[PDB]
Design a protein around this nucleic acid. Structure first.
Ligand SMILES: [K+]
Ligand SMILES: [Mn+2]
Ligand SMILES: [Mn+2]
Ligand SMILES: [Zn+2]
Lengths: 117, 341, 618
DNA sequence: TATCTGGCCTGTCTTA
DNA sequence: GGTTTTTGTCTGGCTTCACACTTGATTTGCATCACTGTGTAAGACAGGCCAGAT
DNA sequence: CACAGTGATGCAAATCAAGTGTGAAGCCAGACAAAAACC
């Protein structure tokens, strides 16, 4: 974004308010009122010259039951938590290293007919 | 051996692969028409005479006592010495194999028109199962006559045959069959020398022996280059059959055989491989105890014959063969030639 | 800056223009509607739409606030493909283009429709035969089978010049039944029977066979096949269940001659007239069929095993093919009926009093009588004795009449009488070929002027349908001088139009009972008209189909209930599907054309698929 | 007498 | 210039959503194969033959 | 160098589905001010 003079004014006022009142949560509709009254010829010149530096910044800016692997990894999830992308990497490595997957595939074989029907 | 083109008359469509020619006193006749006999010729038998390279097929009639045999493709045909012809097996227009046997004999010859007698011979004992592509010949031993029948094909037996392969065929068991026409009985002989099944071979009969040449064995799918001699002895007791392999056998399936002179025959045509036709011709010289197979000069085949995939034919008898190759289709289906010797 | 249109602005921009009406709306909602601005704008918009007759957008917005997803099940996509005639290749264009514009996959991709097909084709459902079928395999996953059925093709054998594919007869039937399940259930229900009731059902099947000409041969390597096809089809005609001592019509085909229910069973490129190849290919089919006559098919419909017995009626055959497959002589012969032993001369003198005597069984006997000649007879006498049966039958047909060809042949005869009435042949016996040519040209021109019929080369179903009217006789009388013969023609046509409904309707008993009642009476006067006022044509001769029509129609009707529904016309209409599917629904190559057409022709006959298209008509 | 053109016919060739 | 309408910016936190990896299984996309049909009747020209004209 | 198909095959590419907490995008509030078109 590119920031007008009034906008720089409002930002600096928000910075002042935060440093004066740290534990304080500002309301927006009242803050725009008080900032607009403060803006409504010498004070504003600082913000006026700041805005052209921000314009230069703009120029710079332009430049189905699950797989047997799924049945196995769901259960092994708690042990890895005790030990997502990282969890799945570990799950896949240990599943690859493992008659081991015959029971999970029998459960999936029971579930395949149920998906079909 | 001179090759000659032949023209054909209005009923050229009758002539098909598996047809047969029979010779009665020099007059040739034709049997095995395509489709069932029509009212133009109810017997299915035709006087087959070629005059000046034009063939006219004219209907012949039967005797009152005759059977009306169905047209048969690839039956075993044989000449019997009073002259008569034996037809055994073959396919009917309905693709059934017939187990029957028929006898073709001239009943009458008044004013050069011939009436035939077709009588069915009943057969008991070890009757050969219905077949096509098989040989039958008559041997003479010690003043006795006996019929020999070898090889061929049939459909699967009723126990194993299934509709999905309803048309599958298998070689018959290679048992030699002695068949006495006098009594109507048949005797089967299993021989060690005849191990494989064989069909579409050539058969040559002299005295008490029959030579078995070439053929195709379905199980192996080979066209063996073997020759088998089969001798039959006719003593007062039960006859005995002895077989001998004799090397120097031709390799040809579906070849045609004709007799040029007594004791010399020519073997032409047929196939050496499924895609390779046998263009060479062989001469057989017979000795009372010996058989001689000699390469002879190949005929001047035309380019049609050379490049045809299939050819078919039969022997006309006077050392002249009637040949057929598939022709152009719209014209006439087959192109016919005559090769003389 | 002229105010832009409100739709062009950015969100922020449209906010500023509507901020005045936005605050005015938040009031209405808190005062009248519990502060539901969402539901008060949703309703104001929807109502604005239907105010401008824009119901579609409103109805869509409704579906998207409900949020239900839109997508067709694959089987429903299949039905739309199969029944609107789209090719996979065209349907893929439709699918792809919809999914790219909507962003949603309304239609399913082809691999799924191809999976949806599997249920609807033979070889998917399991069944068994008690007793087991003789000579048939008991495998149940047999789909499309090679139609040559292991026909030997080695160069020594007889030359194989056809390509053919088929279904296994039972496996096919099974697939038909399972296609009809819902219609079988609902047919019990409307008969007040138990859905789950499983007694001995009975399936009557119509068998049809025909040849086609003018089937072009493809380029490419393959058998050099003939330019003709043959088709064997069956239609499921009725199913009755035995509940007590009553047979309950669970199902009857509403449209017995529709292409929609003539199911394909065997396609071959071959010539019906080539007996050797015809029997080679069809004999395995007749064997399978023979086997099913002596077994009961137990098959599982809706959970409950049911049993089906089968009755086979071969009636969709033209007379040419009947005679060919039942060993009878060709239609030229003196033995003019395929239903009786009458002779052409006899049918001309008696005309009406003949009963049905021939049968597939009788014929088989008589061939054997022919072949063996047991009374050592002469060939004239032998042929007399066997009444022309001089070849061995191989297919069992009902002795009936095909309406389509009957209707055709009859009209073709009338077209001839018309000519010979124009030339006054009733009075001048001899006439040059040139003189007859012009009789036909006269009549041809006139049928065009008075009836809007262009001449056609060979006679037509619709031409017959339109020629055999009394209006056409009026037209034709304008060309005949003698009104004594206007009266003869008018009567002859009256009798015919009294008769025709008997052998064309589905239930004559219900649909023209007085035509059925009078048939023996009307057919006598027709016969007598031909014998007196039409001596010149009908002395000593009559046409095959006049005989069939005058002598055997009432017997047939009491044996079977209908003629018109056993007619070939359903199968002939199937030929039209053959030509289309070979062009536009098959791989375009010699070794795939038959099966692709066989399969996709079967789907087109599936009631399950057809049902989805009558869903609008709940 | 002794030729002689024109129709007539058939048959191929060029494009469809 | 005066005037009118589009787009913002300032802030803290509200919601909704895509992303993050891996494994094996489904589901889509896509190219590949050898073949399809639409190309389509009659006029120009020569050369033989024989009866009636020159 | 015609050209848009004709359906089945099979291999590559996409998608799926689960675990939870990251940041990113849009948004609200009042008030005033850039730009950007018009007399
Ligand atoms: K129709
Ligand atoms: Mn037909
Ligand atoms: Mn037809
Ligand atoms: Zn009759």
């Amino acid at each position: 974004g590119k920031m007008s003079s009034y906008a720089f004014f409002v930002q600096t006022c928000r910075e002042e308010h935060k440093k004066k009142h740290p534990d304080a949560s500002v309301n927006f509709s009242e803050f725009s009122k008080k900032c607009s009254e403060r803006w409504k010829a010498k004070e504003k010149g600082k913000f006026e010259d700041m805005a052209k530096a921000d314009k230069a910044r703009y120029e710079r800016e332009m430049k189905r039951p699950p797989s047997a692997f799924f049945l196995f990894c769901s259960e092994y999830r708690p042990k890895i938590k005790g030990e997502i992308g990282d969890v799945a990497k570990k799950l896949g490595e240990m599943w690859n290293n493992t008659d081991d997957k015959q029971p999970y595939e029998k459960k999936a074989a029971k579930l395949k007919e149920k998906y079909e029907k | 051996v001179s090759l000659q083109m032949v023209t054909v008359g209005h009923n050229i469509a009758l002539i098909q692969p598996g047809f047969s020619l029979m010779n009665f006193d020099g007059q040739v006749f034709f049997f095995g028409q395509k489709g069932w006999p029509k009212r133009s010729c109810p017997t299915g038998v035709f006087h087959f005479d070629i005059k000046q390279n034009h063939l006219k097929l004219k209907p012949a009639i039967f005797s009152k006592d005759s059977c009306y045999l169905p047209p048969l493709r690839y039956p075993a045909t044989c000449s019997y010495k009073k002259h008569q012809y034996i037809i055994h097996g073959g396919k009917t227009p309905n693709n059934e194999l017939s187990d029957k046997i028929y006898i073709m004999s001239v009943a009458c010859k008044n004013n050069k028109k011939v009436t035939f007698r077709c009588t069915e011979k009943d057969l008991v004992g070890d009757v050969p199962e219905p077949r096509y592509g098989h040989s039958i010949d008559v041997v003479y031993s010690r003043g006795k006559s006996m019929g020999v029948l070898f090889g061929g094909r049939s459909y699967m037996p009723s126990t194993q045959r299934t509709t999905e392969k309803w048309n599958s065929v298998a070689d018959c068991l290679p048992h030699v069959f002695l068949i006495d026409f006098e009594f109507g009985c048949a005797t089967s002989y299993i021989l060690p020398e005849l191990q494989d099944g064989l069909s579409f071979h050539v058969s040559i009969a002299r005295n008490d022996t029959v030579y078995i040449l070439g053929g195709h064995s379905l199980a192996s799918n080979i066209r063996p280059a073997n020759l088998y001699r089969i001798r039959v002895d006719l003593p007062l007791g039960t006859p005995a059959v002895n077989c001998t392999v004799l090397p120097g056998g031709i390799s040809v399936s579906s070849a045609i055989l004709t007799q040029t002179n007594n004791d010399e025959f020519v073997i032409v045509g047929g196939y050496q491989l499924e895609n390779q036709k046998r263009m060479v011709c062989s001469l057989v010289s017979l000795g009372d105890n010996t058989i001689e197979i000699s390469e002879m000069e190949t005929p001047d085949w035309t380019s049609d014959i050379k490049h045809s995939k299939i050819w078919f034919g039969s022997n006309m008898g006077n050392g002249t063969i009637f040949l057929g190759i598939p022709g152009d289709n719209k014209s006439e289906a087959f192109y016919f030639y005559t090769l003389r010797c | 800056r002229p105010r832009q249109h409100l739709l062009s602005l950015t969100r922020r921009a449209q906010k500023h223009r509507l901020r005045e009406l936005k605050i005015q709306v938040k009031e209405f909602a808190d005062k009248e509607e519990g502060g539901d601005v969402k539901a008060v704008c949703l309703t104001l918009f929807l109502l604005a739409l239907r105010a401008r007759n824009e119901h579609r957008q409103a109805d869509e917005l409704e579906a998207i606030m409900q949020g239900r997803g839109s997508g067709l099940q694959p089987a429903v996509c299949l039905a739309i493909r199969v029944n609107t005639f789209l090719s996979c290749s065209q349907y893929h264009k439709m699918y792809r283009t919809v999914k790219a514009i909507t962003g949603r996959q309304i239609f399913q991709p082809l691999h799924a429709l191809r999976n949806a097909e599997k249920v609807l084709l033979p070889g998917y459902h399991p069944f068994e035969w008690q007793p087991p079928l003789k000579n048939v395999s008991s495998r149940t996953d047999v789909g499309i089978i090679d139609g040559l059925s292991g026909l030997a093709s080695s160069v020594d054998e007889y030359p194989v010049d056809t390509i053919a594919k088929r279904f296994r007869y039972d496996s096919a039937l099974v697939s038909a039944l399972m296609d009809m399940e819902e219609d079988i259930l609902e047919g019990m229900r409307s008969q007040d029977l138990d859905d789950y009731l499983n007694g001995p059902f009975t399936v009557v099947v119509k068998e049809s066979c025909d040849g086609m000409g003018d089937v072009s041969e493809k380029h490419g390597s393959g058998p050099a096949v003939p330019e003709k096809a043959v088709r064997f089809s069956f239609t499921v005609m009725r199913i009755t269940i035995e509940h007590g001592s009553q047979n309950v019509k669970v199902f009857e085909e509403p449209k017995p001659n529709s292409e929609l229910c003539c199911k394909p069973l065997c396609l071959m490129l071959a010539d019906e007239s080539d007996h050797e190849t015809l029997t080679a290919i069809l004999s395995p089919l007749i064997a399978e069929r023979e086997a099913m006559k002596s077994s009961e098919l137990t098959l599982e419909m809706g959970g409950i095993p049911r049993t089906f017995k089968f009755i086979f009626r071969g009636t969709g055959y033209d007379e040419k093919l009947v005679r060919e497959v039942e060993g009878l002589e060709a239609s030229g012969s003196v033995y003019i009926c395929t239903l009786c032993d009458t002779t052409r001369l006899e049918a001309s003198q008696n005309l009406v009093f003949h009963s049905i005597t021939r049968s597939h069984a009788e014929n088989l006997q008589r061939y054997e009588v022919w072949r063996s000649n047991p009374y050592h007879e002469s060939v004239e006498e032998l042929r007399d004795r066997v009444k022309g049966v001089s070849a061995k039958p191989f297919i069992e047909t009902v002795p009936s009449i095909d309406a389509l060809h009957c209707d055709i042949g009859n009209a073709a005869e009338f077209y001839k009488i018309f000519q010979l009435e124009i030339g006054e042949v009733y009075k001048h016996p001899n006439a040059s070929k040139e003189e007859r040519k012009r009789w036909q040209a006269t009549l041809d021109k006139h049928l065009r002027k008075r009836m809007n019929l262009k001449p056609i080369m060979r006679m037509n179903g619709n031409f017959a349908r339109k020629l055999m009217t009394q209006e056409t006789v009026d037209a034709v009388c304008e060309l005949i001088p003698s009104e004594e013969r206007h009266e003869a023609l008018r009567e002859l046509m009256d009798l015919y139009l009294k008769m025709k409904p008997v052998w064309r309707s589905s239930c004559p008993a219900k649909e023209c009972p007085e035509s059925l009642c009078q048939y023996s009476f009307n057919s006598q006067r027709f016969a007598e008209l031909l014998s007196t006022k039409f001596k010149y044509r009908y002395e000593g001769k009559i046409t095959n189909y006049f005989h069939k029509t005058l002598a055997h129609v009432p017997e047939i009707i009491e044996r079977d209930g209908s003629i018109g529904a056993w007619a070939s016309e359903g199968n002939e209409s199937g030929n039209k599907l053959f030509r289309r599917f070979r062009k536009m629904n098959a791989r375009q190559s010699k070794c795939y054309e038959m099966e692709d057409v066989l399969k996709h022709h079967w789907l087109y006959t599936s009631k399950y698929l057809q049902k989805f298209m009558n869903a609008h008509n709940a």
